Design an enzyme around this catalytic site. Structure first.
Site, PDB file in Angstrom:
ATOM      1  CG  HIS A  67       6.621  30.376  45.514  1.00 44.66           C
ATOM      2  ND1 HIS A  67       7.885  30.524  45.161  1.00 44.66           N
ATOM      3  CD2 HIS A  67       6.519  31.373  46.491  1.00 44.66           C
ATOM      4  CE1 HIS A  67       8.260  31.242  46.093  1.00 44.66           C
ATOM      5  NE2 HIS A  67       7.759  31.854  46.664  1.00 44.66           N
ATOM      6  CG  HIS A 105       0.561  34.436  49.615  1.00 46.14           C
ATOM      7  ND1 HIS A 105       0.176  33.366  50.134  1.00 46.14           N
ATOM      8  CD2 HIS A 105       1.883  34.537  49.671  1.00 46.14           C
ATOM      9  CE1 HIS A 105       1.343  32.643  50.293  1.00 46.14           C
ATOM     10  NE2 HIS A 105       2.183  33.428  50.200  1.00 46.14           N
ATOM     11  CG  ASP A 216       5.078  34.625  52.016  1.00 46.74           C
ATOM     12  OD1 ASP A 216       4.773  33.640  51.603  1.00 46.74           O
ATOM     13  OD2 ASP A 216       5.657  35.693  51.269  1.00 46.74           O
ATOM     14  CD  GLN A 268      17.982  28.721  54.535  1.00 45.13           C
ATOM     15  OE1 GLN A 268      17.336  28.660  55.485  1.00 45.13           O
ATOM     16  NE2 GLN A 268      17.942  29.195  53.420  1.00 45.13           N
TER      17      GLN A 268
HETATM   18  C1  K7O Z   1      25.184  31.368  48.202  1.00 46.94           C
HETATM   19  C2  K7O Z   1      23.899  32.042  48.780  1.00 46.94           C
HETATM   20  C3  K7O Z   1      23.963  33.440  48.895  1.00 46.94           C
HETATM   21  C4  K7O Z   1      22.866  33.852  49.625  1.00 46.94           C
HETATM   22  C5  K7O Z   1      21.511  33.252  49.877  1.00 46.94           C
HETATM   23  N1  K7O Z   1      20.514  33.555  50.634  1.00 46.94           N
HETATM   24  C6  K7O Z   1      19.894  32.649  51.168  1.00 46.94           C
HETATM   25  C7  K7O Z   1      18.503  32.362  51.569  1.00 46.94           C
HETATM   26  C8  K7O Z   1      17.690  31.611  50.484  1.00 46.94           C
HETATM   27  C9  K7O Z   1      16.267  31.736  51.071  1.00 46.94           C
HETATM   28  N2  K7O Z   1      15.384  32.493  50.665  1.00 46.94           N
HETATM   29  C10 K7O Z   1      14.232  32.170  51.309  1.00 46.94           C
HETATM   30  C11 K7O Z   1      12.701  32.857  51.382  1.00 46.94           C
HETATM   31 CL1  K7O Z   1      12.325  34.028  50.326  1.00 46.94          CL
HETATM   32  C12 K7O Z   1      11.884  32.409  52.331  1.00 46.94           C
HETATM   33  C13 K7O Z   1      12.226  31.420  53.246  1.00 46.94           C
HETATM   34 CL2  K7O Z   1      11.091  31.017  54.402  1.00 46.94          CL
HETATM   35  C14 K7O Z   1      13.641  30.930  53.496  1.00 46.94           C
HETATM   36  C15 K7O Z   1      14.115  29.842  54.265  1.00 46.94           C
HETATM   37  N3  K7O Z   1      14.548  31.430  52.231  1.00 46.94           N
HETATM   38  N4  K7O Z   1      16.076  30.935  52.275  1.00 46.94           N
HETATM   39  N5  K7O Z   1      20.609  31.406  50.468  1.00 46.94           N
HETATM   40  C16 K7O Z   1      21.826  31.761  50.087  1.00 46.94           C
HETATM   41  C17 K7O Z   1      22.866  31.326  49.472  1.00 46.94           C
HETATM   42  C18 K7O Z   1      22.818  29.835  49.347  1.00 46.94           C
HETATM   43 MG    MG Z   2       4.879  35.637  46.813  1.00 45.82          MG
HETATM   44 ZN    ZN Z   3       4.206  32.866  49.572  1.00 45.14          ZN
END
Ligand code: K7O
Ligand code: MG
Ligand code: ZN
Length: 312
Positions: A67, A105, A216, A268
């Site tokens: 961020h 942002h 975003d 993912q």
């Molecule tokens: C064990 C487990 C459980 C639930 C999970 N949910 C994720 C996604 C995390 C995530 N968040 C974001 C955000 Cl806010 C933006 C972008 Cl652009 C991206 C690419 N991401 N990726 N990983 C997880 C894992 C490893």
């Molecule tokens: Mg933010």
């Molecule tokens: Zn952002």
């Protein structure tokens, strides 16, 4: 007057949705100004004020893994691409306000989620009960706008000025992902029941909110190595938050627990399916020329699928 220009590869590739702004920090302000100039005009901002605004913005992002200042400029570039591909759908205040909103942002982000601020009982969580960080970012934006020689909107009337700041406020609040789900559902329903109307201000607001979520999240719309490498920064923050949760004696959600490194490819997938794909699908239905974002997101979901299958 003084046009900003970019080397040929950048000049051509900056027009595309999947452009990566590169590792040279010192070129990012120039990249932003180039974008303001082509999407808004060389007359939108007084050059000296704008440069001074940009540099104060930059100074107010912190050196966190994801961020950070690079993320702000990236999110602004995706907004640029959207605006350039739908040039006639947006008012002049919108063009003015939205790139600024994108650059601003995540101002002063510390790398922790709203939920962590609430559990830590950070003073910001008493000041703002919901969308805690996002109200903070808009607040920082106003601060910087009010520094001497930093008023880039000086040429606007009292009421135009209030309109632009209100565009900015709403765009920034919309980057709270908790709010995105409900917003995308409403938009889905309105598009499908044919009631979506871009002359309705509250409809525009929703459409702009979804644009913000799309910009975003745009790291999922890049070339695979950019996507994959950015994911590393994303988890570096989430896992530091997880450790901090454990310090408070709270088991963090699996997303933030570094002990669950192994499940990344699977997290993912959930994320592309629950959040990203629906986001770019609805965006493409509403704004057809943004389809390359959906197309790239699907390519990247397919890459995470390959990582699970052991083919990567
Ligand atoms: C064990 C487990 C459980 C639930 C999970 N949910 C994720 C996604 C995390 C995530 N968040 C974001 C955000 Cl806010 C933006 C972008 Cl652009 C991206 C690419 N991401 N990726 N990983 C997880 C894992 C490893
Ligand atoms: Mg933010
Ligand atoms: Zn952002």
């Amino acid at each position: 007057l003084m046009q900003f220009t970019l080397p040929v590869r950048l000049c051509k590739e900056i027009e595309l949705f999947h452009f990566d702004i590169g590792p040279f920090e010192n070129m990012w302000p120039g990249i932003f100004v180039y974008m303001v100039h082509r999407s808004c005009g060389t007359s939108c901002f007084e050059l000296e004020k704008l440069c001074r605004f940009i540099m104060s913005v930059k100074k107010n992002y912190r050196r966190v893994p994801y961020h950070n200042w690079k993320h702000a400029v990236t999110v602004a570039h995706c907004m640029y691409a959207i605006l350039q591909n739908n040039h006639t759908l947006f008012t002049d205040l919108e063009r003015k306000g939205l790139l600024i909103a994108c650059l601003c942002h995540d101002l002063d982000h510390r790398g922790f989620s709203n939920s962590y601020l609430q559990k830590f009982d950070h003073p910001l969580a008493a000041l703002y009960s919901t969308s805690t960080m996002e109200q903070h970012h808009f607040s920082q934006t106003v601060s910087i706008l009010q520094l001497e020689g930093h008023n880039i909107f000086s040429t606007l009337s009292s009421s135009e000025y209030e309109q632009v700041l209100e565009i900015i406020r709403k765009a920034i609040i919309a980057t709270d992902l908790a709010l995105y789900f409900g917003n995308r559902k409403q938009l889905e329903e309105m598009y499908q029941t044919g009631s979506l109307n871009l002359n309705n201000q509250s409809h525009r607001d929703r459409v702009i909110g979804l644009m913000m979520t799309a910009c975003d999240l745009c790291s999922v719309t890049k070339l695979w190595p950019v996507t994959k490498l950015t994911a590393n920064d994303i988890y570096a923050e989430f896992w530091a938050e997880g450790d901090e949760m454990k310090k408070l004696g709270i088991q963090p959600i699996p997303m933030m627990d570094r002990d669950k490194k192994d499940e990344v490819p699977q997290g993912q997938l959930g994320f592309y399916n629950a959040v990203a794909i629906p986001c770019y699908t609805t965006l493409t239905q509403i704004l057809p020329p943004t389809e390359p974002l959906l197309k790239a997101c699907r390519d990247n979901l397919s890459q995470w699928e390959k990582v699970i299958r052991g083919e990567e």
